[PDB]
Design a protein around this ligand. Structure first.
Ligand SMILES: Nc1nc2c(ncn2[C@@H]2O[C@H](COP(=O)(O)O)[C@@H](O)[C@H]2O)c(=O)[nH]1
Lengths: 153, 148
């Protein structure tokens, strides 16, 4: 199988891959990533990242109940939350141009744009068209080339 | 520093305190901390910590399904797990001198020796006397005076 350290650094790479199919209407100088809820694989994310075009991705944790997530965060990496916590977060986001990714696949039904599946030999992910449409950001459909090619043994 | 980063530090300071009331059958040169499962506040632990007596605490994440948890870890900081993962974890711990703490602990009825409660103006924690009794490590009784 695959160690926690192995998967962490993979997740950060898959996320860099997703970020590249996403456009914000008002592109920031520093992309702000916010890790919300308990997470297993965001340890690599939280070191900061760098996009291929040179833009820095600043990452930090925020409280679920933070009323201004959607404002403080450009991208949001969602960890293990409960029904109440989730509704909080996705209400905090509603209206704003924000990309949401989840560490576990269960959250796609309930508000997340991309959901990861870190188990297995590779990291695959899934998307939700409803959540993406209402997101406020633009996503090129080629982003699934990455989800399909990661699922291909 | 956000509220998570400050609580992350408080979680550090609290775990260090709790450590100072625990003893290992054979005390190790470096204390092995294992962060296991989804966590919010383990970011301070993971940066490394040093005890009052100067000992390095080395912290690293390990898988829930890791079968060698009992021998790889001196202390386990347990994040979110379900009943199967919990049971699995403690099967891997039984028979080894391992101090166990968990980031969430409304109940503290079954599982870890101590359970944190990071919510609120300050960090509190409760003790599970049964887990403490049969764990392998000695716990100076005075620590319960630091509990809720
Ligand atoms: N403060 C302190 N307590 C110790 C030390 N070594 C052992 N102890 C405590 O003494 C206990 C032994 O208890 P006893 O043998 O009296 O029944 C150990 O489990 C531990 O709690 C030490 O170096 N310092």
């Amino acid at each position: 199988r695959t160690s926690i350290e192995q998967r962490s650094n993979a997740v950060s790479q898959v996320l860099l891959g997703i970020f590249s199919y996403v456009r914000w209407p008002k592109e920031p100088a520093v992309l702000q990533l916010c890790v919300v809820g308990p997470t297993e694989y965001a340890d690599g994310l939280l070191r900061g990242m760098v996009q291929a075009n040179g833009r820095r991705v600043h990452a930090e944790r925020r409280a679920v109940d933070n009323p201004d997530l959607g404002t403080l965060c450009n991208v949001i990496y969602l960890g293990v939350v409960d029904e109440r916590e989730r509704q909080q977060v996705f209400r905090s986001l509603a209206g704003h141009p924000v990309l949401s990714i989840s560490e576990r696949g269960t959250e796609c039904s309930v508000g997340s744009m991309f959901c990861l599946n870190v188990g297995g030999p590779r990291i695959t992910f899934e998307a939700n068209l409803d959540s993406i449409a209402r997101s406020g950001v633009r996503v090129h459909p080629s982003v699934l080339k990455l989800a399909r090619r990661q699922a291909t043994p």
